[PDB]
Design a protein around this ligand. Sequence first.
Ligand SMILES: CC[C@H]1OC(=O)[C@@H](C)C(=O)[C@H](C)[C@@H](O[C@@H]2O[C@H](C)C[C@H](N(C)C)[C@H]2O)[C@](C)(OC)C[C@@H](C)C(=O)[C@H](C)[C@H]2N(CCCCn3cnc(-c4cccnc4)c3)C(=O)O[C@]12C
Lengths: 49, 82
Amino acid sequence: AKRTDAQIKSKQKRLEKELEKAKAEPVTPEYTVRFSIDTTHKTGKRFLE
Amino acid sequence: SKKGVGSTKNGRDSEAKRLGAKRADGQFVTGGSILYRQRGTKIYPGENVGRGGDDTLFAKIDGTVKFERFGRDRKKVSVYPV
RNA sequence: GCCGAGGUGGUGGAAUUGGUAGACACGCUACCUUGAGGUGGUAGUUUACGGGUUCAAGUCCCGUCCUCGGUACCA
RNA sequence: GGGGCGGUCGCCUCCUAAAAGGUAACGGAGGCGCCCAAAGGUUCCCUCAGAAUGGUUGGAAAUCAUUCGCAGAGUGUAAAGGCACAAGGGAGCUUGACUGCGAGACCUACAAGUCGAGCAGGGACGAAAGUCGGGCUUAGUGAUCCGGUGGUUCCGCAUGGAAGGGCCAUCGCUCAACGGAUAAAAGCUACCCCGGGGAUAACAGGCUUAUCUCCCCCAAGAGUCCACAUCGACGGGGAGGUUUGGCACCUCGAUGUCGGCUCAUCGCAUCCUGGGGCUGUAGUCGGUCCCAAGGGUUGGGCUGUUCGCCCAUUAAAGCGGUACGCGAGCUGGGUUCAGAACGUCGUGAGACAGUUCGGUCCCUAUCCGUCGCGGGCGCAGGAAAUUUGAGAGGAGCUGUCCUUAGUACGAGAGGACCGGGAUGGACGCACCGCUGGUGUACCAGUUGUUCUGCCAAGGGCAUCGCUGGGUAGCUAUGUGCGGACGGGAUAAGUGCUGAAAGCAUCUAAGCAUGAAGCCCCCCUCAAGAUGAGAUUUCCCAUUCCGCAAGGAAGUAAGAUCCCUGAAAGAUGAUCAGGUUGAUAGGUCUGAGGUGGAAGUGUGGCGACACAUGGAGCUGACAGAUACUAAUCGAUCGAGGACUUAACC
RNA sequence: AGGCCCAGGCGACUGUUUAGCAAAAACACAGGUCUCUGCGAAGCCGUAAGGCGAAGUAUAGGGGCUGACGCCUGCCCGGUGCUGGAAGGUUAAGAGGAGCGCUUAGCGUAAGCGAAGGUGCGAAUUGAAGCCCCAGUAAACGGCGGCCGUAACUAUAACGGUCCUAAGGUAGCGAAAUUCCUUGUCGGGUAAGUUCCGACCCGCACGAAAGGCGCAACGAUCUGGGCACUGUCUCAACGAGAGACUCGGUGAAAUUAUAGUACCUGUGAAGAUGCAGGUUACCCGCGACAGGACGGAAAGACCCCGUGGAGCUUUACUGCAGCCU
RNA sequence: GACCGAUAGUGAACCAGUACCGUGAGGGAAAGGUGAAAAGCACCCCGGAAGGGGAGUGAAAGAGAUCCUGAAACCGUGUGCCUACAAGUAGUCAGAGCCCGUUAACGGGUGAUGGCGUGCCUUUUGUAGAAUGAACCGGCGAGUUACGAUCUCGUGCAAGGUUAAGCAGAAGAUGCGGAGCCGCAGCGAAAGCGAGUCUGAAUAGGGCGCAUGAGUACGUGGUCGUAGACCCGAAACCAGGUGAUCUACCCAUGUCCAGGGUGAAGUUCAGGUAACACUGAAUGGAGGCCCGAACCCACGCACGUUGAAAAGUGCGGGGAUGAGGUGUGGGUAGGGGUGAAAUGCCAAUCGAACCUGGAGAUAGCUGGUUCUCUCCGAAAUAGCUUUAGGGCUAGCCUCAAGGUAAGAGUCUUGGAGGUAGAGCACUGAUUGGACUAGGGGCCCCUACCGGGUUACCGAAUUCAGUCAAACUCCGAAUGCCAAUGACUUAUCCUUGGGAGUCAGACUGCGAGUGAUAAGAUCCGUAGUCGAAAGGGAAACAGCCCAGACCGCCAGCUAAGGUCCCAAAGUAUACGUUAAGUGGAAAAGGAUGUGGAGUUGCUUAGACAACCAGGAUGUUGGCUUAGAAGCAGCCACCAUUUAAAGAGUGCGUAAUAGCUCACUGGUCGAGUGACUCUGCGCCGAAAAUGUACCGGGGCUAAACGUAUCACCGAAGCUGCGGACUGUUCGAACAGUGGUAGGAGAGCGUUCUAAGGGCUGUGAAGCCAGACCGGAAGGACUGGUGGAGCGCUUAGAAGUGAGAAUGCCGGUA
Ligand SMILES: CC[C@H]1OC(=O)[C@@H](C)C(=O)[C@H](C)[C@@H](O[C@@H]2O[C@H](C)C[C@H](N(C)C)[C@H]2O)[C@](C)(OC)C[C@@H](C)C(=O)[C@H](C)[C@H]2N(CCCCn3cnc(-c4cccnc4)c3)C(=O)O[C@]12C
């Protein structure tokens, strides 16, 4: 159990050291708006003369 | 057999701070000397005793110390001269 | 009992607090086409729960319930 | 409370904390690594939460008045302490969230940390008094070193500068393992090595007994009725120290581990056998309980296995202690050494949360202890025999079949206690006549080669050359025997008489039965039984010293040295003998064993057969026999203390 | 001067191997394949000369892997390696020198400015390989999924849906040297078989060159059965020789505080010969036996500790040789 | 020469870098003494010699060739005393008997017998330890030196102390040499200023100073620092060499392989065809082919396992013509070679050879660390620590100088603090009743609208009760802080030198963790041990008593005891128990007894026992063929009667048959429930053996109450010594001790001035019945045969019982 639990910490120290050397951030997302519209009113025919 | 449960969660404790009487009744006491370390005002300042910023009761003048009472149920330090 | 994981529509399931009964693929319903089915075309149905935080909650937080698995009594 | 894992590492508050202060544990709870330009300062104001009513949409509960509410509210934030003269709420004005300090204190190993009246300079608010060096107190943070920034009547390697340094103010550290080893760091080791510890783990011992095993109380209920035939819930009380554990007290200058083998012994909580009481015990069989540890308690298949299941017996195939008895007694299959492989994990060396094949079990016994055998002396003379028994050891088990008797019982099916008899199993003791074994100086056959000069007859060697028999001795698988009959006292139990207590009662008195158990009977050892015993019998009380006690020195009866030896034996010992003698060897007769000797003759060409001829040979066997050796010797070995009593 | 037969696992075999615990299923092997290398080859030894390779020349020579033979060797190039490309981004030192300090003649009544020079620093620009990027390669390193519904119901799913992935384990094999559950279940062998054999297949946790499946022969290999055979055992007995034992000669050694060295129960550093209370025991040897002297031996090999060591590993840290540029 | 003297000093006093050991590099000993001189034993005897006894020589022959002296271990001979029914850490104390007759004194050797008694060392909380170390004896073997720092003590000079190198001088002292160093003046980072000075704006405040002034040069001593720094000990690392005579592979070059089988390719012949294929004979001789000797290798067993042998023997086993065995010559060398790969092999070494150097690596770890007495005497704790078995500071100990009577106890008095207890007034928990908005459920209709009910739950109110470490309206006993006086004892404070200790244990109490288990763990508190002997608890660190300077053949006591082991009461008085309770344990069970308290029956008459009653309404009706209760309901009813339930027992498959109930007669006075408590009973089992009194054994020799004696310690007292401290020869007080601090000495070797004793016999050695408080010191006698003590100083290679120490001798 001690032999397995010494590996279980060695791999975590390797993990944290490679993550401090890596420092590769998640990529910031591109920009979207979604924005859209409705204007769904029942409307007549004639507007501008 | 040794089955594992851990995690006490309650190890820590703060350092003992020495509240309470530092000088006694009828004690000769110089100026500026701390008469009572407390939190809150368990005991009030009376004559010639000031309450500090950490509400310790200290003596403003030289003289003996008296712990009288503030009447109903309440105490008081007062320093008198000789 | 303890630890770790997930609880969405009939289904499998994405969603870094910012609009989802559902946005995505199926089912499902009503119609059309066809002799009648199938395919195809048109339209349609509160996030396990309860209480907050917030202008805004599936998400952030505190508790309850369920299911997967590891870890036990026993056969 | 071994190490790893988990958890923690610094600071604050409460409880532990034992009415000062302090105080630990991997004790119980919580928080912190900040926030606020007002949530600071001052001045002036003023009082909270809830409840009961009146009130739209307003809801149980917003806001309103209204009474009652010295306190739950509020206090930026955990928790404690504190607060309504506000520290809690408003509004104005403000920057003291100042600079240089600081008498004196608390705290503390240090480093640090906390409080501080007052002084001066400049202010804020206030009419003034005054208050203000942050907040309601305690958390909200880290040394130094090295660098940055700002400022300075500081220094500046000859001089003037400068580079650079100092000082002051300050910034960069989750250096979070928070008094911070570096600016910078993860693993394998079964290929391993060293220095230490029983300061520290496992085994076994010890304390404990939660757990385990066992026992019991209460009694609801089950048991057709009926708690107590047998069961016994919910709960309760204990014993034991065999389980899994707790703790680390002995051992790390070594306390070898499981299973098996050999050998046991002990406890009784009894598996069989013995005796019993209760029954929901008709009988055979049973169930439970009490007494009893005397004896016994199997052989196989698989597994390393203990365990377990199975097969087939048994009267039964008991549970536990002894370092899970027993490795200076044995085995080494399993597990945990080095090789190697599979599955799986790891990037990896390697590892196991697994499996598989192979793998050095050392020691001449000093003491105690066991089992045997001797040698000395004792035992008030010296000797030879036979002994009593204190004491001690052994043995102590039991089947089946028949008779009683198909009787008792039962409706039947089924089927007895008790009382007799035979024959067994295991075990034990003896012995070899029988059956067998072994028999290496017995007898025979035969091969190879070699020797006796040759044929014939023999010898050597080849495991005793091999092979077929085999005497004595030793021996079991063979034979003979035994554990039987009984007393006496009991245990459980069953009772008589019988009160205390006009009765009842196995009771205190008085008596009696009653078990494989206890003491005997049976077998062995046994007077070192220093408590040294008792019988019957032999020898007798001599010689010098010396003045005695006493010494020594010839003996008696008796024994030994030495010798022939076996019925005995490691050696001693025992025993049979030592010339008036069969103790051994030889001899000669025999038994037994082997089997038809050699020579000769005949028959056959010959291998060979047959006769002479139950022949010849013959180790340990037994009966005669003085043939040979037990020769002559020599040594040791009594002279019997004292007192008293009794006798004559 | 052979024991033999029946079946199985692994390895084709003959060989080799831990001298002194492991002889093997481990190495090696013929075979297969991948890759390097145009010959001053590649790789290797050496700082270099000089060599090996090799007086060899791709049918040759190094290196990895797998191991005769038979049938075969599936999917994934997303990650890591190689291999190729390289337009572009980055990227060193060296180059370049815009400028800013510092000093200073001089100008300035002060304050300050200040040429040239020296000197300290230094921006833009250029600057390879590598890396980022784009493709190929799995007999390279490696990896090879879930869930839901659906058939005369009693069950499963040929089928369909949908997430996820780089792809979701194909053939063949499967309680195996791999199966924890476990002594799976069924069948055989056996009176009885946790092992064995043949099946099944919910494969904890097989699987195709860490090769998959078979396979005649071979094997001081491992495993199960059987014939013959036997003191291996029921259950021991006897005989022979060498020691042991007695006598004559010779004569060590480990060990060892001094020892006139009992056994119960107890106590005690918790397991006494030595202590306590009892119980027993004349003095001295000889052959035996090994229960104790926590016996002898080896300053525990297990466990922890030491801010001990040493071999190994890697995407631990920091370096170095080599190799590109 | 204040160096060595044969285990020392070179490794080597001697034919020594020798003998040995290794292939090699390299490692590396042991071992001195006749005499003044050979005068080294002519001669005789035993003896084969060896070796002797005489005789000679000699001063000595005990001086005779490993030879001066010649210890101890060890081994022998003779005898004085003891010893063959007694277990004895081996002694000591008592003690007869015997045998002697000394350094002549409360002699000496032995000791039957009695009481007591589990070695030394180290490490430990604790060791007889079944933990370690040593077989014994002997020698050797560990805190030293240099330079520097500081403190005490000493001396000189002192606000001035003093030179170093050097020169001269017998390896000297001394003279010269003041260059230098430390001080006299501090403060500040520095400029600087100066009895002041920095900070500061400050004439302020504070820090550090001096006004209350001693240093300096040497010397002894303590300690620290740098050196191997107190001895011994690693595994390891590095540098340069030496090794393929073993073994791995390779290179050149030879050589070995008895015999027997199987029988490939090919070839030939015959058949066969169109020719081939093909078939069959023969021939041939292949083969990491087979069986099997030599040889090689090692798998199985048994033996050996202080071996025949540091890897073998015996019996079997594999290969045994090719990846073969093997000889000879040769090559590769350590961070390297070699490897059909095991990290295997590289000279009986291998996860990195051996040797020599760095090197006396380092070791926070283990072991040891040697003479004595006296005064005093700890700690096992806090904080911090890559720290946890280590270290530093503080606490605790010691010495000195100081200040000096501050300390300490108790009484009186004043305070702070909120536990134990208690209480509910907060905060939580929580039992029941009363009401009680409301939530359901039965529903009625009906716009869930209105309701109608329930003993179905109830938020909030009230009364009454409980409980709390993190609850307090309250609040102790103590402990704590003081002042004040009062007594009563001295021990605090400061400064400096030196430490050690940071593993603690158990018991009583207050808590925690644990299971309100543990000889458990962790704190507070007090004791004891540690570091404490003596007496008791049988034995027993830690429990109870009490603290050891020493002697005594003296007394009184503590705890514990008084029948015998075994000292003291078979003591007294009054009760209890009878189980061996005492001398082991619970729930629970029980007519065991002793003592207190009430109550009912109660001579117009109980209890026990004897006799007769065993009913009436009504023989009780259903689920039922029954139940006169009786397998179970329904009334718990009511008079015949002095007295009877329609039922508590028994029984049947149920009634049946009965018994008690309940009252009468006979009898003739204690009887029949309950509570408290004292002492007992069962409940009650385990492992070699009585085995839970120590034993015998006890019925008081147990227990309870009470009283008086006595025993009982190293306590106290008496007497007599010794030492230390206090007051000025006496008084008073004291004196266990680990680590450790301090003080006084003893001894060894050498040197120095003195002194003198030794050939009429030095040191050494061997004996003694001598002296001193110890270490130790003489005096005789005997061996020895030439050096050695005493007094005062000095300097140390300074004292051994322990290192699994080294060497030697011997068990
Ligand atoms: C032959 C007997 C050997 O014993 C055993 O090895 C073994 C039987 C043991 O059981 C023995 C008693 C062990 O004790 C045990 O140790 C354990 C670690 C602990 C045990 N207890 C403490 C629990 C303890 O009993 C131990 C440790 O031995 C290892 C004792 C220790 C002192 C020894 O090592 C010991 C000296 C062994 N040895 C070492 C060489 C071994 C290599 N080798 C093998 N063969 C040869 C050989 C052959 C032929 C020729 N040459 C050489 C050489 C020998 O030469 O002989 C030995 C004594």
